[PDB]
């Protein structure tokens, strides 16, 4: 008369990226990110060029690109109608991923540092979830972008109202509610390259709400973390062997040491031990030639080794590692391995989440917090219903605040550190400098090195 299938004990629980993205090519998916590049993660500064037309100082004309946009769109439509008229796959080259062509939209994020974030070259879809009205309904309010789907079971934490259409970014990484806003009347988009400036207008900008993670970010020193590091290094080594023109395929070690400089060379040797051997003398000297019995894997096997979403999860982990490391348990709970594990476990029904907490990326009552609470004088329906209603309330507050077009008005020891320094001036002198640090941030970082260097003996 009921379920009676013990399903939680037996079963406890489409996106096509560009060919530069699924092949993990090194501008788009970096092999190594240093500390200053991990602090500027997904916020790349405007670099000064050393050679090129923009490297020479002076005024530089921006160039309109509307003949280029319509020429490329007409050319892609000719390609599509020559191939039978169906839907085609166009992003096959890195030069397809420029902003100079196609219909660009912008997508702004509500959180400062999301748990997962797409790299350049990866695809996402726009799904318009539309819950019909009870009984008769006119049809989904039509939307310019995305495809419409009728959702009786809400994908997000809250539930859709009857007759409410909600757009969302959907990919393998996350699923997040987006809200279309019109652009400001003053802002244009300047694409600078080495050759010059180019200008587009923008008309559509989405605001992306709190992400619902679908991929689990690994923890630091995890088994999945070390497995991804080893597999990424192996894929890079195989693609360097494929790029080699020598008839016995051969690579150099310091190419891999340039790509992965934080790696100890014992690990790189370990990856090269099987599939290569070092020639010291004769021909191919100081090269790692490929073994003659070793079949180098094909392109689809190398693609099946590492996925781009695993690289995004690893980049999220190491960026969060840097941010936590720079900021000296509440912060550790807000780390994406914890929050992604909490949300995916909540979606399997393992556990519940306190929707008000410190993992809240807003810092106010808006938005959720993905940290695990146990699912346990009611100990069953009361807790479950309370969690459910708080989830619908937060989902509905966030939707309203984000889609608002209303204008918003612009708005322990108490001990300092003092250091005495003794130095020798030119000729003969012994001046002593007493310097006082009143910044408690400078204090903490300063002292921590001494205490470490005091133990480093």
């Amino acid at each position: 008369p009921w379920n009676l299938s013990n399903d939680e004990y037996y079963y406890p629980k489409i996106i096509q990226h560009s060919i530069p993205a699924v092949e993990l090519r090194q501008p788009f998916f970096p092999t190594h990110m240093g500390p200053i590049k991990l602090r500027q993660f997904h916020r790349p500064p405007l670099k000064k060029y050393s050679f090129g037309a923009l490297s020479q100082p002076g005024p530089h004309s921006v160039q309109p690109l509307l003949k280029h946009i319509k020429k490329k769109a007409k050319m892609r439509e000719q390609e599509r109608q020559a191939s039978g008229g169906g839907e085609m796959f166009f992003m096959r080259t890195p030069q397809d991923l420029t902003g100079k062509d196609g219909d660009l939209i912008l997508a702004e994020y509500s959180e400062e540092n999301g748990p997962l974030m797409m790299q350049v070259g990866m695809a996402t879809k726009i799904k318009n979830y539309y819950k019909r009205k009870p009984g008769k309904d006119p049809g989904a309010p039509d939307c310019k972008y995305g495809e419409t789907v009728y959702c009786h079971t809400s994908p997000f934490l809250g539930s859709l109202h009857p007759g409410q259409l909600l757009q969302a970014f959907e990919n393998n990484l996350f699923r997040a509610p987006i809200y279309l806003h019109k652009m400001p009347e003053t802002d244009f988009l300047i694409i600078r390259t080495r050759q010059g400036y180019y200008i587009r207008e923008l008309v559509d900008i989405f605001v992306v709400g709190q992400q619902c993670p679908l991929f689990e970010v690994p923890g630091p020193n995890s088994k999945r973390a070390n497995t991804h590091i080893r597999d990424f290094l192996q894929v890079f080594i195989y693609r360097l062997f494929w790029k080699s023109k020598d008839r016995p395929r051969r690579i150099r070690m310091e190419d891999i040491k340039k790509a992965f400089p934080s790696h100890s060379e014992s690990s790189i040797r370990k990856r090269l031990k099987l599939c290569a051997d070092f020639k010291r003398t004769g021909m191919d000297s100081n090269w790692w030639v490929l073994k003659s019995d070793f079949r180098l894997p094909t392109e689809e096997e190398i693609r099946a080794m590492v996925s781009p979403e695993q690289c995004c999860a690893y980049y999220s982990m190491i960026a969060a590692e840097q941010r936590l490391k720079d900021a000296g348990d509440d912060e550790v709970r807000t780390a994406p391995w914890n929050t992604t594990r909490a949300f995916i476990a909540a979606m399997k029904g393992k556990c519940l989440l306190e929707v008000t907490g410190v993992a809240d990326p807003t810092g106010c009552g808006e938005g959720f917090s993905y940290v695990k609470i146990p699912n346990k004088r009611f100990s069953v329906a009361e807790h479950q219903e309370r969690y459910k209603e708080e989830c619908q309330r937060i989902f509905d507050l966030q939707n309203k605040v984000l889609s608002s077009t209303e204008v918003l008005s612009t708005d322990a020891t108490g001990r300092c550190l003092k250091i005495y320094r003794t130095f020798r001036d030119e000729e003969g002198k012994e001046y002593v400098r007493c310097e006082t640090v009143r910044k408690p941030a400078v204090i903490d970082a300063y002292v921590r090195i001494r205490t470490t260097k005091d133990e480093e003996f």
């Binding site: 501008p27 004309s61 921006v62 939209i105 900021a327 077009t405 300092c416 003794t422």
Partner: protein, 144 residues
Amino acid sequence: PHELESQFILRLPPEYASTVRRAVQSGHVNLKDRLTIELHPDGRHGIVRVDRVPLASKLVDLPCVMESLKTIDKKTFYKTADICQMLVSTEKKFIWNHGITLPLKNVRKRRFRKTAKDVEKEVKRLLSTDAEAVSTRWEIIAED
């Protein structure tokens, strides 16, 4: 090799924004002569010249992260670049508190969770001074 393109947002005064918008939607190369951009070696200062009229510019850091997403069929969207900087035309001064969209205003102050314990660089300079020294004396102090 391939270098990731660097896109930023240019904000103009509203009358100059209307002239630049009309010249962009027209599409001639006449706009190329009319609109120029000179970035100073400060890195956070510039002139944008609209119709040969100089405007003073500052390259500021945006509080959220934007991403340009191109499409061919308006159903699948491919990420092309990350935008984090804006050349508004008319350090703490080079940080913008508001976001571009209307719901995101005072985001850095209100909708951003702040966790706290430049400073690291100052600590490195202090360590270098201690190394170049001979004798170092330290005491956590009180009010003085």
